[PDB]
Amino acid sequence: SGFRKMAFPSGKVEGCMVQVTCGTTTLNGLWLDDTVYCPRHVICTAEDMLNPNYEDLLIRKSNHSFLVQAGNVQLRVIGHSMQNCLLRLKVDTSNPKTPKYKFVRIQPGQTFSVLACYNGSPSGVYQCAMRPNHTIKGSFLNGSCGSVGFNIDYDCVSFCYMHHMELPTGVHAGTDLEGKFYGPFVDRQTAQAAGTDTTITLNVLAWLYAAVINGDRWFLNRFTTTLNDFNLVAMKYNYEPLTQDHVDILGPLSAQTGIAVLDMCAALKELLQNGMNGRTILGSTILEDEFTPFDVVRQCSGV
Amino acid sequence: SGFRKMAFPSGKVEGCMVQVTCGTTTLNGLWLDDTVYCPRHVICTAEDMLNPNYEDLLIRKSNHSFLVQAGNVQLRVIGHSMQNCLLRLKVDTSNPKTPKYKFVRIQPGQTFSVLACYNGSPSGVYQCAMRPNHTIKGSFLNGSCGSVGFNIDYDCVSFCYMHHMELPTGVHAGTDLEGKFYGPFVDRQTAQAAGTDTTITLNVLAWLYAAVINGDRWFLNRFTTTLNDFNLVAMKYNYEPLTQDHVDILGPLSAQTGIAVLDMCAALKELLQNGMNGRTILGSTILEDEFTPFDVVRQCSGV
Ligand SMILES: *[C@H](O)[C@H](C[C@@H]1CCNC1=O)NC(=O)[C@H](CC(C)C)NC(=O)OCc1ccccc1
Numbered sequence: 370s371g372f373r374k375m376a377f378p379s380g381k382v383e384g385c386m387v388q389v390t391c392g393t394t395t396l397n398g399l400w401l402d403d404t405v406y407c408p409r410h411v412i413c414t415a416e417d418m419l420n421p422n423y424e425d426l427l428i429r430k431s432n433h434s435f436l437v438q439a440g441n442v443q444l445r446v447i448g449h450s451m452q453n454c455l456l457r458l459k460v461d462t463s464n465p466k467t468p469k470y471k472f473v474r475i476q477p478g479q480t481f482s483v484l485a486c487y488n489g490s491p492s493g494v495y496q497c498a499m500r501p502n503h504t505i506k507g508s509f510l511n512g513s514c515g516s517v518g519f520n521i522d523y524d525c526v527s528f529c530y531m532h533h534m535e536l537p538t539g540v541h542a543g544t545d546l547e548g549k550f551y552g553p554f555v556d557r558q559t560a561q562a563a564g565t566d567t568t569i570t571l572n573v574l575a576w577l578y579a580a581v582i583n584g585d586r587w588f589l590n591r592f593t594t595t596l597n598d599f600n601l602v603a604m605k606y607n608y609e610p611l612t613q614d615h616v617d618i619l620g621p622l623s624a625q626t627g628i629a630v631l632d633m634c635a636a637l638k639e640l641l642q643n644g645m646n647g648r649t650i651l652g653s654t655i656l657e658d659e660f661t662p663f664d665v666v667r668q669c670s671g672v
Numbered sequence: 673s674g675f676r677k678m679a680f681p682s683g684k685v686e687g688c689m690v691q692v693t694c695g696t697t698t699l700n701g702l703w704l705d706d707t708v709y710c711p712r713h714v715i716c717t718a719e720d721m722l723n724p725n726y727e728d729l730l731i732r733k734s735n736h737s738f739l740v741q742a743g744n745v746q747l748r749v750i751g752h753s754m755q756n757c758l759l760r761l762k763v764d765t766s767n768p769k770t771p772k773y774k775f776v777r778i779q780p781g782q783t784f785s786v787l788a789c790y791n792g793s794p795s796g797v798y799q800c801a802m803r804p805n806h807t808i809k810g811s812f813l814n815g816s817c818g819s820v821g822f823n824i825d826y827d828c829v830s831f832c833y834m835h836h837m838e839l840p841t842g843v844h845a846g847t848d849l850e851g852k853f854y855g856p857f858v859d860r861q862t863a864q865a866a867g868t869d870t871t872i873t874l875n876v877l878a879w880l881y882a883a884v885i886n887g888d889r890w891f892l893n894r895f896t897t898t899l900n901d902f903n904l905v906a907m908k909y910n911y912e913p914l915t916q917d918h919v920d921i922l923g924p925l926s927a928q929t930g931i932a933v934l935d936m937c938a939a940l941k942e943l944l945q946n947g948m949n950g951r952t953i954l955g956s957t958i959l960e961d962e963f964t965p966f967d968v969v970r971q972c973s974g975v
């Protein structure tokens with residue numbers, strides 16, 4: 370009868386983190402079999418980061434101009450290359466502690482754990498979701514670039530995010546493990562800003578079903594809505610519209626619970642139009658949106 | 673300029689988790705050098721758990737009546753013993769992946785990470801605090817007993833909690849790694865209940881300093897209080913009284929920030945007596961109390 374934000378266990382990823390040092394710039398990278406992935410801005414200097422041409426910067430570099438540590442050991446770079454916003458560094462060693470793994474591009478709304486690292490060494494782990502404006506509400510200090518995000522699905526690590534930068538509003542932006550940014554950002558110390566964020570409706574609904582599965586039913590109601598009429602209020606409270614695809618996803622949850630999706634929608638419309646009367650759902654006073662339908666099922670069981 | 677609940681990286685502890693199976697009862701245990709720690713109620717049957725005499729139950733058991741798995745491998749028990757609410761099981765193998773470690777008894781208010789496990793295998797990690805009524809607000813399903821809690825301080829794991837049970841209100845109770853319970857609980861399926869909880873004042877204050885260190889100052893004020901006058905309102909809002917020891921602990925935070933402790937107190941008294949005007953501190957709408965002064969310093973830096 371309890372329920373909260375849970376991060377994936379982080380051992381499989383700890384063994385892949387390493388230092389990458391290039392002049393006076395030090396950040397983290399990811400050592401999979403004989404390759405090390407890291408943000409390309411590791412080769413800029415202080416000046417460089419306002420307007421770099423990474424083509425230009427990288428032809429100036431040698432395999433020896435990159436220093437890589439794994440605790441004590443130094444690692445020999447024997448090749449380097451650029452894949453969009455990451456460098457791939459070849460090394461003379463296969464990481465013996467490389468897990469079964471995949472590179473995935475996540476869609477917005479989806480959640481993942483991030484292992485926050487500094488100077489190659491893990492510092493903490495926490496759970497995060499990709500916002501609809503393609504940022505994440507992270508916790509990242511100077512030196513965190515290269516920290517990764519990931520899910521685990523039956524011993525197989527799915528890497529989905531590498532950290533590159535913090536936007537003026539305090540939110541964070543980055544790329545998948547193929548170097549393509551999430552969002553319209555570029556890896557440049559310039560005037561960029563996060564676009565308007567919205568609430569992830571699918572996850573809010575997922576969490577209300579969790580509230581019911583943990584015994585709690587005070588917000589439900591008799592009324593009901595259509596999809597169209599629910600979206601009219603979604604818009605004016607800045608919630609993503611609900612789609613038949615999203616309704617379908619809430620299938621197992623609505624089945625386990627007895628509550629049709631559009632009734633949970635009517636409940637949410639009621640909660641939006643009237644706040645919540647000094648009440649809480651699963652210990653929270655606010656509608657929380659960083660749990661997916663799949664997180665909810667992972668955690669709990671019973672009604 | 674961002675800030676949240678962060679758990680310790682969990683790799684050093686993942687390598688110590690194992691299954692312990694005894695008839696039809698299966699739970700987790702902790703494999704340090706040649707010893708495995710686990711809750712003693714692993715030897716009860718369904719009936720037994722209402723009123724066990726664990727003396728009685730254990731003289732009936734043999735080293736062979738305990739089954740221990742570490743993934744595939746089965747482990748040979750060659751000794752067993754009872755230390756208050758834990759069993760110590762001797763095995764023919766030293767865990768090769770045992771870290772530098774300590775057993776610590778935490779005090780209330782202090783925080784730790786828990787690695788939630790089922791059938792010997794890690795499932796998730798999250799951050800938790802020992803409430804003043806000696807429970808924790810956890811997330812634990814059937815089969816979670818034996819899951820541990822821990823901090824890390826320069827590569828050395830400090831184990832402080834083993835999970836034993838869930839109280840009727842949905843909160844959780846357990847022991848240190850010497851088998852002494854936190855709180856007046858016993859490991860018995862009987863009528864027990866959590867006593868009245870209170871808010872951890874020290875941590876709330878710690879977090880307001882974090883709010884200032886992340887730029888944010890809207891709740892501060894000109895007024896000030898004495899310690900005595902602040903406690904009169906602490907009582908009637910169910911906050912722990914503040915003590916000169918607690919004032920002293922907030923020393924580095926008040927120094928880094930410019931704000932004397934009793935002024936932050938006056939700010940908090942103001943926030944208590946007038947709610948918060950649809951405002952948030954570090955993204956939260958509520959006074960949050962599961963960060964210690966030491967967590968706060970760990971995370972951030974800058975004003
Ligand atoms: C890489 O370690 C770093 C992580 C930033 C630094 C502060 N908080 C973070 O998340 N990335 C950058 O510093 C980035 C440089 C690349 C785009 C070339 N610049 C940036 O993120 O500007 C924001 C900033 C905020 C606070 C201090 C310094 C920079």
Ligand SMILES: *[C@H](O)[C@H](C[C@@H]1CCNC1=O)NC(=O)[C@H](CC(C)C)NC(=O)OCc1ccccc1
Binds near residue numbers: 713815818860
């Ligand atoms: C050990 O795996 C288990 C963990 C409980 C089970 C459900 N949620 C938990 O945290 N411990 C017990 O089941 C405990 C037995 C020992 C005291 C002998 N009994 C208990 O905690 O009763 C509460 C309960 C709640 C929901 C389902 C079953 C039991």
